[PDB]
Design an enzyme around this catalytic site. Sequence first.
Site, PDB file in Angstrom:
ATOM      1  N   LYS A 113      63.055 101.791  16.538  1.00 60.91           N
ATOM      2  CA  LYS A 113      61.924 102.584  16.055  1.00 60.91           C
ATOM      3  C   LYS A 113      62.371 103.900  15.424  1.00 60.91           C
ATOM      4  O   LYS A 113      61.689 104.919  15.544  1.00 60.91           O
ATOM      5  CB  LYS A 113      60.912 102.844  17.177  1.00 60.91           C
ATOM      6  CG  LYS A 113      59.750 101.869  17.201  1.00 60.91           C
ATOM      7  CD  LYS A 113      59.042 101.884  18.544  1.00 60.91           C
ATOM      8  CE  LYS A 113      57.913 100.865  18.582  1.00 60.91           C
ATOM      9  NZ  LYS A 113      58.361  99.516  18.139  1.00 60.91           N
ATOM     10  N   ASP A 166      56.759  89.711  13.682  1.00 62.72           N
ATOM     11  CA  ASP A 166      55.793  88.793  14.268  1.00 62.72           C
ATOM     12  C   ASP A 166      56.213  87.333  14.146  1.00 62.72           C
ATOM     13  O   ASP A 166      55.367  86.446  14.282  1.00 62.72           O
ATOM     14  CB  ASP A 166      54.422  88.999  13.627  1.00 62.72           C
ATOM     15  CG  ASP A 166      53.954  90.436  13.717  1.00 62.72           C
ATOM     16  OD1 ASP A 166      54.308  91.113  14.704  1.00 62.72           O
ATOM     17  OD2 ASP A 166      53.239  90.890  12.798  1.00 62.72           O
ATOM     18  N   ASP A 173      47.563  92.771  14.237  1.00 62.57           N
ATOM     19  CA  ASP A 173      48.347  93.993  14.159  1.00 62.57           C
ATOM     20  C   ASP A 173      47.672  95.003  13.240  1.00 62.57           C
ATOM     21  O   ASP A 173      46.874  94.640  12.371  1.00 62.57           O
ATOM     22  CB  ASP A 173      49.771  93.697  13.686  1.00 62.57           C
ATOM     23  CG  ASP A 173      49.828  93.227  12.251  1.00 62.57           C
ATOM     24  OD1 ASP A 173      48.898  92.520  11.817  1.00 62.57           O
ATOM     25  OD2 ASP A 173      50.813  93.562  11.558  1.00 62.57           O
TER      26      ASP A 173
HETATM   27  N1  LIG Z   1      60.686 103.049   7.733  1.00 61.57           N
HETATM   28  C1  LIG Z   1      60.604 103.657   8.940  1.00 61.57           C
HETATM   29  N2  LIG Z   1      61.532 104.555   9.336  1.00 61.57           N
HETATM   30  C2  LIG Z   1      61.459 105.166  10.533  1.00 61.57           C
HETATM   31  N3  LIG Z   1      60.479 104.946  11.424  1.00 61.57           N
HETATM   32  C3  LIG Z   1      59.481 104.073  11.156  1.00 61.57           C
HETATM   33  C4  LIG Z   1      59.492 103.362   9.869  1.00 61.57           C
HETATM   34  N4  LIG Z   1      58.411 102.566   9.856  1.00 61.57           N
HETATM   35  C5  LIG Z   1      57.764 102.748  11.034  1.00 61.57           C
HETATM   36  N5  LIG Z   1      58.404 103.643  11.810  1.00 61.57           N
HETATM   37  C6  LIG Z   1      57.968 104.074  13.158  1.00 61.57           C
HETATM   38  O1  LIG Z   1      58.358 103.063  14.084  1.00 61.57           O
HETATM   39  C7  LIG Z   1      57.226 102.371  14.603  1.00 61.57           C
HETATM   40  C8  LIG Z   1      57.317 100.919  14.157  1.00 61.57           C
HETATM   41  O2  LIG Z   1      56.851 100.046  15.177  1.00 61.57           O
HETATM   42  P1  LIG Z   1      56.386  98.559  14.785  1.00 61.57           P
HETATM   43  O3  LIG Z   1      57.162  98.119  13.568  1.00 61.57           O
HETATM   44  O4  LIG Z   1      56.436  97.712  16.033  1.00 61.57           O
HETATM   45  O5  LIG Z   1      54.834  98.756  14.398  1.00 61.57           O
HETATM   46  P2  LIG Z   1      54.327  99.057  12.900  1.00 61.57           P
HETATM   47  O6  LIG Z   1      54.736 100.544  12.449  1.00 61.57           O
HETATM   48  O7  LIG Z   1      54.905  98.077  11.956  1.00 61.57           O
HETATM   49  C9  LIG Z   1      52.524  98.921  12.888  1.00 61.57           C
HETATM   50  P3  LIG Z   1      52.101  97.163  12.846  1.00 61.57           P
HETATM   51  O8  LIG Z   1      52.461  96.547  14.141  1.00 61.57           O
HETATM   52  O9  LIG Z   1      50.523  96.993  12.592  1.00 61.57           O
HETATM   53  O10 LIG Z   1      52.925  96.440  11.670  1.00 61.57           O
HETATM   54  C10 LIG Z   1      55.974 103.041  14.062  1.00 61.57           C
HETATM   55  O11 LIG Z   1      55.187 103.561  15.135  1.00 61.57           O
HETATM   56  C11 LIG Z   1      56.453 104.173  13.178  1.00 61.57           C
HETATM   57  O12 LIG Z   1      56.053 105.424  13.738  1.00 61.57           O
HETATM   58 MG   LIG Z   2      53.793  93.919  10.924  1.00 63.51          MG
END
Ligand SMILES: Nc1ncnc2c1ncn2[C@@H]1O[C@H](COP(=O)(O)OP(=O)(O)CP(=O)(O)O)[C@@H](O)[C@H]1O
Ligand SMILES: [Mg+2]
EC number: 7.2.2.13
Lengths: 985, 34, 264
Positions: free
Chosen positions: A449, A683, A338
């Site tokens: 999200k 995950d 990730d």
């Molecule tokens: N605290 C928060 N408040 C609102 N939106 C958020 C947030 N943190 C992340 N987001 C948005 O929601 C999405 C989160 O998706 P997800 O949690 O599946 O991936 P991630 O942001 O954790 C990257 P990774 O998979 O490498 O951990 C991101 O694309 C971000 O734009």
């Molecule tokens: Mg993660």
Amino acid sequence: VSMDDHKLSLDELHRKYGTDLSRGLTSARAAEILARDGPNALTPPPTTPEWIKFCRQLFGGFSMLLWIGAILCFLAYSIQAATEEEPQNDNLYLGVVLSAVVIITGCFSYYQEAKSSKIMESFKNMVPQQALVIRNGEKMSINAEEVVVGDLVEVKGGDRIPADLRIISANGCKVDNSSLTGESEPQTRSPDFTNENPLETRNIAFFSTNCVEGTARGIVVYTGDRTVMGRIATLASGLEGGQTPIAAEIEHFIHIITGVAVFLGVSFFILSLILEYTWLEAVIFLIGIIVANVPEGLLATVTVCLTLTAKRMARKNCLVKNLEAVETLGSTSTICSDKTGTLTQNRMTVAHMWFDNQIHEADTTENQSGVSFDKTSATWLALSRIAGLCNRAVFQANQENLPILKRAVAGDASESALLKCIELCCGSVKEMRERYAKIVEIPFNSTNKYQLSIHKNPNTSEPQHLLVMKGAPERILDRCSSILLHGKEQPLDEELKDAFQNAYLELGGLGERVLGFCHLFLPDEQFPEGFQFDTDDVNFPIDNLCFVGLISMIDPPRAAVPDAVGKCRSAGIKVIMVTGDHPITAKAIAKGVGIISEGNETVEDIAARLNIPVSQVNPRDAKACVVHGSDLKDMTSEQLDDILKYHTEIVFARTSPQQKLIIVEGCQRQGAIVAVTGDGVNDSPALKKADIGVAMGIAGSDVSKQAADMILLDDNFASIVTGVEEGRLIFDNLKKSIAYTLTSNIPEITPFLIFIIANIPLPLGTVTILCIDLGTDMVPAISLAYEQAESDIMKRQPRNPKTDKLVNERLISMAYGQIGMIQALGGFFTYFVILAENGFLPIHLLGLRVDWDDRWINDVEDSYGQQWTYEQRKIVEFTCHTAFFVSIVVVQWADLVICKTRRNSVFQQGMKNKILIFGLFEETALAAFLSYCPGMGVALRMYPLKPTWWFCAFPYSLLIFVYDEVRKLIIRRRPGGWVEKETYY
Amino acid sequence: EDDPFFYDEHTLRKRGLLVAAVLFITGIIILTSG
Amino acid sequence: WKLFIYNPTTGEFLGRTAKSWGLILLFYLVFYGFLAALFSFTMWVMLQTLNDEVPKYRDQIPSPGLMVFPKPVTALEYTFSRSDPTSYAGYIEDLKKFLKPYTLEEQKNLTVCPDGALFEQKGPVYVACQFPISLLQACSGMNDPDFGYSQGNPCILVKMNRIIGLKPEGVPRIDCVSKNEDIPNVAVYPHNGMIDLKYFPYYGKKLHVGYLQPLVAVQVSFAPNNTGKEVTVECKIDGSANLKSQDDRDKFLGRVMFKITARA
Ligand SMILES: Nc1ncnc2c1ncn2[C@@H]1O[C@H](COP(=O)(O)OP(=O)(O)CP(=O)(O)O)[C@@H](O)[C@H]1O
Ligand SMILES: [Mg+2]
Ligand SMILES: CCCCCCCC/C=C\CCCCCCCC(=O)OC[C@H](COP(=O)(O)OCC[N+](C)(C)C)OC(=O)CCCCCCC/C=C/CCCCCCCC
Ligand SMILES: CCCCCCCCCCCCCCCCCC(=O)OC[C@H](COP(=O)([O-])OCC[N+](C)(C)C)OC(=O)CCCCCCCCCCCCCCCCC
Ligand SMILES: CCCCCCCCCCCCCCCCCC(=O)OC[C@H](COP(=O)([O-])OCC[N+](C)(C)C)OC(=O)CCCCCCCCCCCCCCCCC
Ligand SMILES: CC(C)CCC[C@@H](C)[C@H]1CC[C@H]2[C@@H]3CC=C4C[C@@H](O)CC[C@]4(C)[C@H]3CC[C@]12C
Ligand SMILES: CC(C)CCC[C@@H](C)[C@H]1CC[C@H]2[C@@H]3CC=C4C[C@@H](O)CC[C@]4(C)[C@H]3CC[C@]12C
Ligand SMILES: CC(C)CCC[C@@H](C)[C@H]1CC[C@H]2[C@@H]3CC=C4C[C@@H](O)CC[C@]4(C)[C@H]3CC[C@]12C
Ligand code: NA
Ligand code: NA
Ligand code: NA
């Protein structure tokens, strides 16, 4: 035992414990309570005594079979002593030697196992459990051992419950009660009393449980061993379960080789009884053959390999739960990683800006001046208000005398960067948030999200409700019909839509995480001041918001990630990037870290270059792809295989937590061993479903750490390269060791077969049979486990577990057909040399077996006309046995040297394994001492060799060495040819 | 005068034991080398 | 396993019979042919260093052994019945076959040699001294067809093992004493048990053509009064210090023990 506060109201909770529901107890009170009560740690139960493990080593493996061998030797000696006066002591010395070998092997294995267990146990404590307690109003991260009775902890999604909690305030809290209930279904925790039985009510936490989603706040009622988990005899963590594939391979090989050895022993025993062998001689021959064929030194080799791996994992700060699982990491062919926290430093700061239809730039750190744009802008004020109000992170306790860029935080990385930026270029966020009261908020989760917040409006305009939202820029923009420009709200039209699209292309192409912000002024008539908002009910209009702008945050990739990813791709491992971020940012980060190599292009890129539509481009023209999460939802199982097959560099974006699991199943369906590197709560299923799971040791959630098999305490991505290298090294060393032990079997069984068939005098006896097995196949085969990695260990493709096994037909073919036969030929040549030099020419030997072994025929005539008594020719026969044993050590010197490597020459891999040279010297010294020590001609029927009889096996040892060297040269010069197809094991 | 039916066994065993001891010592030394 | 030998599919007999099996069989054939050629050449080079006249080493056979003739069916135990012609027929046949070269008709080519002196031969002719069978009285074929059997007086030939280049010092002599309280009479027909020095040294089968080793014949005189009695006869070399006879590891080094049982 049902006496808790589940049915008690909040009124008596404060009085009973003296802790505020919001502020909590002070630090001095907490220290006093800790000094009065003690730490929050279960008492570790002593599982087994130390010498109980010693007995398990002593009587485990083939050591028990050697124990029956020694007992049979002693029993045969006792029978001989009772029957005949002054009997032979060969059985006595044989049993003594067997017992000594068993004891030495057992103590060595116990010492290596103790060292490995000590390393694992000492290095396991390096990851301490952390608890988010609340003290003196502020909240701070405190070690879970310091948790006491009375304090209140802030447990969120992905964090294990520190102790028994009487939950008083929860926001969509759900926990994993698989320890007590026995199911993985999350159970919603809410403060209201539901069931009289505490085990069924949903306002209590039961310790050692994982909070799946949401966050909750509760007072610790039970701590230490007084918890519910403490009462039950069964331990909360328990022991890891499952059989490692390399362990299964060892078990299958051991079963097959033991069956073969037993069959050969029984056949030889029956054949000996047919050929006028005494019962005691036949039984001793049986046990000698059986001990010779089994690889009883294999388990010590496995333990040594595991201990060396434990040594090399500890220095790289890798925490491995099960040392056998490193071989799976070496066998890994695909790695799913990730973006945030694994391929990136997870230390992000606000970098770029976009509102009022223009891209602004902000200093990430150390601006030391006013912000470039005007802070008086109404749009900027609204954006800052949304960022401050929607944020859940709060600053740590007592950090008000240090720069904001160095202030510690408690929330996520994105909220931390937002808080830092708002503090830098705004007012005090604490008083700003106190100005706008919080009514209801929906915590951020990967399913939706986005994050939502409701705040009152104390300005001149008083809608009394502020609907501020933060989340993915694209998702929220679909829910907005108006946009605020220069402080003025206008409906969102196509021009501003594509302006936002190009602006985000500009921001997203720099490898920067971007978030979107919106606010809505709820009308007074729809919702009065005295209105209750439910998180389950829609109530307020979630859509129809007013878009404001974008915050673009720079999140640099980790320093070691590019080189580690390059090494992984050079090792034949396909690294797949799976993430929930935007495809643009994911692709930028993939190109930056090396997931998508330069020159490789996607279908969209090809279409853009050719000006033709994307549908016109042949999908096979692109070896790299960026699969969006929305497309994967409606994507069938068959179609998933095509992308994971035809494309070399795959990036998944906007993927839900379950879609990561779907991708893991899809990758595994192609017969691939996948490694998933996940740290967040999202995950959890992928970590458990993957063949090998990796979790980060600092930023990783507790659930991810529990589910993972390997934990990186240093947060170094090069540790994965080290792990796959050490798994490959384990496999190579085990394969090399097994090959060496197998070759000796043909030299030990061939003399008896030739004895029977050609009716020549026996070339090898039981004592020398066991001298070959113990002397040449224990310390040398173990030393093959200390062999350093080859030069091209990380340059070869990952092994296919189907076609390539630890022991295969090519290993058996090699060790038995070629090397074993050359060794047997050398032994037989030395036999014939000695028998001819004493007067028995090789042609005269055919058919002498009946006359040679006859105790009463004492005029056996040689080729020169001399006549020999029974004892006189028996001395020559036993000298032949001794030289057969000596000749096998000389040929085995070459075999140990050729086993040292699988494709490389011994010239390329120098003799830097000092254990192997020690084994060579010790086996040679043992052979010389057995031959030349006085009294061995009576003790074991071994007689001195004349000086020139040592060199009879030299041409065969040189033949082995030269043939193996030229075969390896052919392997390297002509890869994939016939020689590699058949000989390369 | 060379005599058949006789071999210098004692000299052979003494030299063999010396070589065995030398190999034993060298193996120990190479093992604990540093 | 199941199937794995089916003619269809590229997998036949756990592989490809047409190509994989043929190539692997050819490789094994070439490999083992080269190994056999190397083994044969190495043994040929070893055999080039040997001499066909005298063995390279003779330290493993420093002293001769005593062996009786003919060899009984089980462990030097002569069991026979004077009433049954077939009980001792094998002994008579074996003695006749063994003593054929010792007859005067057969050994006319051999030369007579002076008695009492060791007869050393440096010349390449290597003549062999003749051993007249007449020295064994009542234990040769001329006295009677059967060698003392059917009369209760069996003959047992006590022959001395041949060693190349052995020169027994002094006067060798084989003495036989019955362990059965000396009740029977043991007779050695050569005077005392004398073995003449003119036969030694032995120069090998290749060089010393027509060698006739000295023989000693013992008759265990079974009296008509005792039948079905087993007697142990102990024979050893006495007069020569060069020939060792007091050895515990080897029970046949200059010494032999045999038992005779007469029936009816
Ligand atoms: N605290 C928060 N408040 C609102 N939106 C958020 C947030 N943190 C992340 N987001 C948005 O929601 C999405 C989160 O998706 P997800 O949690 O599946 O991936 P991630 O942001 O954790 C990257 P990774 O998979 O490498 O951990 C991101 O694309 C971000 O734009
Ligand atoms: Mg993660
Ligand atoms: C599994 C391993 C088994 C190893 C042992 C094999 C079995 C051995 C059993 C019997 C063989 C007895 C010897 C055979 C030869 C006897 C005849 C002979 O005496 O021969 C003479 C020749 C030439 O001598 P000369 O006259 O010049 O000397 C005279 C010198 N003077 C005069 C001084 C004495 O000597 C020669 O040519 C040398 C001839 C040697 C022939 C060997 C053939 C057998 C070899 C097998 C190895 C196969 C390897 C692969 C196995 C695959 C299994 C599936
Ligand atoms: C005069 C008395 C007899 C002479 C002296 C004694 C001679 C006996 C020598 C030992 C015989 C041992 C043969 C082992 C053969 C291999 C078997 C095995 O375990 O293979 C593992 C393997 C198991 O491997 P696996 O199950 O991991 O692989 C299966 C294949 N895939 C990968 C697709 C799943 O055996 C097999 O099932 C496959 C190989 C074929 C096995 C059969 C080989 C021929 C057997 C001939 C036996 C001849 C016996 C002669 C006895 C004579 C008595 C008078
Ligand atoms: C008189 C003659 C006497 C001859 C005696 C011969 C003694 C032979 C000693 C045993 C050798 C075989 C040891 C097998 C050990 C296997 C270990 C293991 O885990 O294997 C798994 C492995 C699994 O490997 P794999 O999974 O790669 O196999 C799959 C195969 N493919 C890829 C093609 C689909 O199995 C083997 O390696 C099996 C090897 C084949 C064994 C062939 C034996 C042939 C028969 C030998 C002679 C027997 C007597 C014949 C004459 C009888 C006359 C009456
Ligand atoms: C000398 C006599 C008495 C014993 C000879 C044993 C020989 C013939 C046996 C023992 C082990 C056997 C080998 C065991 C394994 C294999 C691998 C297989 O894929 C090809 C055949 C091959 C190479 C066998 C060939 C025959 C073999 C070499
Ligand atoms: C350790 C390995 C690599 C090398 C060992 C070589 C050994 C096994 C060989 C090579 C030469 C051999 C020696 C050759 C000559 C003699 C002199 C003799 O009066 C005693 C035996 C003795 C001493 C031999 C003992 C064994 C010997 C030393
Ligand atoms: C294989 C090719 C390339 C080289 C062949 C080397 C051969 C001819 C050499 C190497 C080792 C040598 C043997 C070493 C030991 C002995 C024992 C000795 O008492 C007689 C000579 C003899 C028997 C040698 C014979 C010749 C020999 C076998
Ligand atoms: Na073995
Ligand atoms: Na073994
Ligand atoms: Na071996």
